[PDB]
Amino acid sequence: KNPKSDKFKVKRFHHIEFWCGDATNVARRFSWGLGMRFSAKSDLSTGNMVHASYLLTSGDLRFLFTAPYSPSLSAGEIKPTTTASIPSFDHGSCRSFFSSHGLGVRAVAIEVEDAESAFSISVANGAIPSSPPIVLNEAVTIAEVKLYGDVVLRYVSYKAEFLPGFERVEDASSFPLDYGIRRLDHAVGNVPELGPALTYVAGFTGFHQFAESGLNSAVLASNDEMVLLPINEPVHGTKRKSQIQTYLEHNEGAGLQHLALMSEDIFRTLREMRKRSSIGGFDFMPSPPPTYYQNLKKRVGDVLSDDQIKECEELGILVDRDDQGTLLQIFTKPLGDRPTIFIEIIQRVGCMMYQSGGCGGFGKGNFSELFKSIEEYEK
Amino acid sequence: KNPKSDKFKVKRFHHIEFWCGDATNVARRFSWGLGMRFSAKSDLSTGNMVHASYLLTSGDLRFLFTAPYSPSLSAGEIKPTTTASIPSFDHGSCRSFFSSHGLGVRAVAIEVEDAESAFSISVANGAIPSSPPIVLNEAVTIAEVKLYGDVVLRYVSYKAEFLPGFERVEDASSFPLDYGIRRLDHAVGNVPELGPALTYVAGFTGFHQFAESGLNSAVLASNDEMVLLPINEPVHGTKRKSQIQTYLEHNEGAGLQHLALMSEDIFRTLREMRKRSSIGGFDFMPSPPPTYYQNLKKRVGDVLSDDQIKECEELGILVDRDDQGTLLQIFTKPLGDRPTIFIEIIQRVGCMMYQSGGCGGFGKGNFSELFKSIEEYEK
Ligand SMILES: Nc1ccc(CC(=O)C(=O)O)cc1
Ligand SMILES: Nc1ccc(CC(=O)C(=O)O)cc1
Ligand SMILES: [Co+2]
Ligand SMILES: [Co+2]
User: What are the VOC domain coordinates in residue numbering (chains A, B)?
Assistant: First the structure.
């Protein structure tokens, strides 16, 4: 049931912005770890005296890393005369965010038909404004509203290259890494209370609900369900403490928990990333025990060959299936010092019409199948 | 002329500690960029609720990356009950340092015979105390005094493995990278006024002076001249603005400008690092024009073959020579967002007795030779 109730025209995920203490080191680690190319920059070398911002791209995935310079470099400026390429940026907000949360996602950015109208309509419908719409070089409009915690939903719209004042980075500094990642599939928030968070966000977007865990969840989706925003809350009382509660504690409250990155070939992606785990890239969660992969034949031997099922097992991939498609997924260990944000790599198979959004779900069945796997391996 | 006036027994450089906003991402970038192995950790997984600290090693070089957790994780603790492995660590100091300076060196650590005596004697001789001596698990004593800006000189002494409460990292997470770097040769500070800085530091250590630039400098050395601490001040009025003044502006004052890392084979090191420049490692300063390498034969054709001189030119290595030894050197671009700290890779040839410290100097003659090179290449 898709009521198609978006209160404004949403297109697709546009970029994710990390607020960093040092954008250079985070962007370089991510580039090597995820196989993303340095695409654009806005920093001192481009006249930005306010923040250093580095854009990595892989397919349609856009990861932006931003850190503040010393405020002294821009002490003379005012908002009308700012050299910041992202006018929403604030030194105090950025430093406060990073000291409070550590490395994390500041903005989930979605492309819309008209960012001014999206902001207007959202705020008229309960959205807490974060940064009013501003037009950049008469070409791009950007506006921000609070999403949850200190994470903003960022609207971007183009009348008609990332953002004005960003420059394309030199080919000598841009090595064409590509491990197969292609787009952002969904971005997941953790909140203390799911009900109020859902009511707030679905309230101002018109996004619709998309049809001992330690958590409860729900997924908000745009009209074509290409912008998917799951939200988790903890469940208290479990024997094992809720991973959402640990997140909230270590993050100092609500924030973005994981980014799901769609791969055009998850096996190549996971081979390429696992090769680099101990040489500056990302670690992955412990693999499921071989019991899990034996039980895979009875569940998805329809969709995957035994050769491909054993390829999952060597890479530690998880597999789930809806009533419509199959989901291949795996999770990294936390991206930085705190047990907060991590990445999920996914590939979806089925639901060809192009592929419809959410095909195969989000792996909810892998909770049950994993604990059953824990019991069979112990035996 | 070496008066051998150390007021306490100094051994050798022990480690360099970076204060980070996220230690994980900086440590991983550095590991891959410099070919340093993850050696030890102190973080949540080791019971440290205060700071995440990661130790990279290459030979005798020890790079430590530290970042604060949320103070809430340790809100119940007091200094007597702290889970911090580095008792000098302070959340407020660390956050203030990183918001003020960005990514930078907090501590230059030297091993001494008795850290308590070194602190006592230093403070009795004008050193501004930073952290009083503390004994760790009856095994290691650590104390800190101000060096310049917010950089501390850290004394470490062992009665008799990095520090108590650090754990050796699992071999699966420790890939044996090695590009040939072996030890810290010197650590360089930038200050607004060289005179007072020298007087202060030489005052409390007894270290002796080691015998249009835009700067003035001087090198303080321990008794055997294995601990070398150069200090720069700007020279105002130059046509091209002083790089020391730019440092001071972007760093918000005095701090560590560069770390010189000795390589057992600078050609292998520079090949390995340059391979990784655009895939998450470090960039290098622009090479000197081929004029410079032609003029190399007339200056060091004694010490290096023409095959090795052309190997310098492809890697962009600089060469200088004292009256005693030859110095091979190259500089990275800044390590993070701000034009502040960078790394120098060096190899020294000559002065065998082991090799005496400072053999070949520090490249001071490469200022003159470089501008003469600029003039000949233009012709
Ligand atoms: N119950 C539940 C439903 C959906 C999600 C979304 C998601 O992306 C993930 O968990 O990987 C999470 C939990
Ligand atoms: N004049 C002068 C003398 C020594 C140094 C020390 C050093 O390490 C470097 O410059 O690379 C710097 C400048
Ligand atoms: Co997910
Ligand atoms: Co040097």
Answer: 12-158, 183-333
The finding on whether B260 has its CB within 6 A of some atom of ligand 2 is: yes
What CATH number has the domain spanning A10-173? 3.10.180.10
Calculate how far, in angstroms, residue A363's C-alpha sits from the geometric centre of ligand 1: 6
**Chain A residue with minimum CA distance to B91:** A99
Per the entry, the structure determination technique was X-ray
The reply to whether A113 sits in an annotated binding site is: no
d(C-alpha B82, C-alpha B80), whole Å: 6
Domain map (residue ranges) of chain B: 10-173, 181-378
A291 contacts A373 by C-beta, under 8 angstroms: yes
Task: With H, G, I as helix, E, B as strand and everything else as coil, classify residue B225.
Answer: coil
Q: Ligand 2: does its nearest atom lie under 6 Å from the Cβ of B219?
A: yes
Which residue out of A13, A108, A188, A327 has the highest number of ligand 1 atoms within 8 Å of its CB and is therefore the one to mutate? A188
Contact yes or no for B231/B218 (Cβ under 8 A): yes
CA B257 to chain centre: 8
B332 SS3 class: strand
> Is A10-173's fold the same as A181-378's?
yes
Which own/partner contact pairs does A268-274 have at CB distance under 8 Å and 24+ positions apart? Answer: A268/A179, A268/A180, A269/A35, A269/A179, A269/A180, A269/A181, A269/A345, A270/A315, A270/A316, A270/A317, A270/A330, A270/A345, A271/A315, A272/A35, A272/A179, A272/A180, A273/A33, A273/A34, A273/A35, A273/A179, A273/A332, A273/A345, A274/A315
The end-to-end CA distance of chain B, in Å, is: 42
Instruction: Supply angle C-alpha A147, B74, B255, rounded to 5.
Output: 85
Which of B95, B93, B196 lies closest to B152, judged by CA? B93
Q: What angle (nearest 5°) sits at the alpha carbon of residue B283, between those of residues A279 and B214? A: 140
Q: Which residues of B touch A335 (CB under 8 A)?
A: 24-25
Pair of tokens at residue A259: 């980014």
Which resolution, in Å, applies to this structure?
1.8
Instruction: For ligand 1, atom 2, name the residue with the nearest CA.
Output: A217
From chain A, the residues in CB contact with B93 under 8 A are none
CATH tag, B181-378: 3.10.180.10
Mutation target for A interface from B28, B95, B178: give the one with most A CBs within 10 A: B28
Is the CB of residue A77 less than 8 Å from the CB of residue A30?
no
Residue A230 CB less than 6 A away from ligand 1: yes
How far, CA to CA in Å, does B64 sit from each of B36, B86, B101, B107?
Answer: 11, 11, 17, 9
| Angle subtended by helix axes A115-124 and A194-205, to nearest 10 | 130
A to B CB pairs, distance under 8 Å: 131
Q: Is A344 in the pocket of ligand 1 (CB under 6 A)?
A: yes
